[PDB]
Structure 1
Amino acid sequence: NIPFTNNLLFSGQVLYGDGRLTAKSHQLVMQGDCNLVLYGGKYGWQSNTHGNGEHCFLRLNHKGELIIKDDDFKTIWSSSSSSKHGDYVLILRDDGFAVIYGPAIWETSPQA
């Protein structure tokens, strides 16, 4: 697996059970009630998927899709933003924006 960094979520990692991205004055929390909620901002964000499922988890894939699945892998919510196949990341930026950047176009050296 990939070590955690409070404000990033690279393709592969999986938040669930009130796990969260944390930045400056914000949190994006994949809550226990299957609702993904960004906290803070002027209004904040939710996917309103409260109660929609059990043991839901969040996961940004390698096609650029950030998805919420319940314990039975039913899609509950998609970022619905599929693009080029490769490595993606989700930053909870210090300005409050949760933004998904990808795919990866340049590196100092390769993964393994």
Structure 2
Amino acid sequence: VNSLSSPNSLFTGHSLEVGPSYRLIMQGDCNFVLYDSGKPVWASNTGGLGSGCRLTLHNNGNLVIYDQSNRVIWQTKTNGKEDHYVLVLQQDRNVVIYGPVVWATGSGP
């Protein structure tokens, strides 16, 4: 899976992955980093700032990193219209947040 949609979360150790060799992981040291074949190409730089962190994408578009005590360790603070959004790790290696919802098949949830 290379997407995380509102209001889902990426708990400690969880990651999104897409070809050719990309992995976006929520590490145990609270550092949210993007790997390219073993090379860190991007990171929230919050390594060591918390324990049991999770990356939550809220329904308003705000992407937040919370520690085990629910403290806001990091956030893009891009919260707007209360709807549904998605975090996408792309094959072009860019990680993007899109929203709100424009259309759906209704085949889910």
TM exceeds 0.5? yes
Q: 1:38 aligns with which of 26, 34, 59?
A: 34
Structure 2 portions without partners, runs of 5+: none
Deviations 1:41-97 (A, max 9, x none): 886111110110010111100000111000111000001211211010011011101
1:77 maps to which of 53, 74, 98: 74
Matches within 5 A, 1:45-84: 45-84=42-81
- Quote the offset at 1:28 in angstroms: 0.7
Number of the residue aligned with 1:99? 96
**Where does structure 1 lack aligned partners over 5 or more consecutive residues?**
1-5
CA distance in 2, matches of 1:80, 1:34: 18
Partner of 1:8: 3
Contact 2:34–2:40 (Cα < 8 Å) also in 1: no
The CA RMSD over aligned residues, in Å, is: 1.8
Shift of 1:108: 2.4
TM-score, normalised on structure 1?
0.87
Which amino acid is 1:53 matched to? G
1:29 corresponds to: 25
Alignment CA distance shift 1:66-1:93 (3 Å): same
Q: How many pairs are equivalent?
A: 107
**Percent of counterpart pairs with the same letter?**
42
Q: Mean alpha-carbon deviation: is it higher for 71-80 or for 37-46?
A: 37-46
Cα gap change, 1:79 to 1:38, in 2 (>3 Å)? same
- 1:3 — aligned with what? none
C-alpha spacing 1:38/1:13, structure 2 compared with 1 (3 Å): same
Match for 2:18: what amino acid? A
In 2: Cα distance, 1:77 partner to 1:110 partner: 34
Give the TM-score of the pair, scaled to structure 2. Answer: 0.90
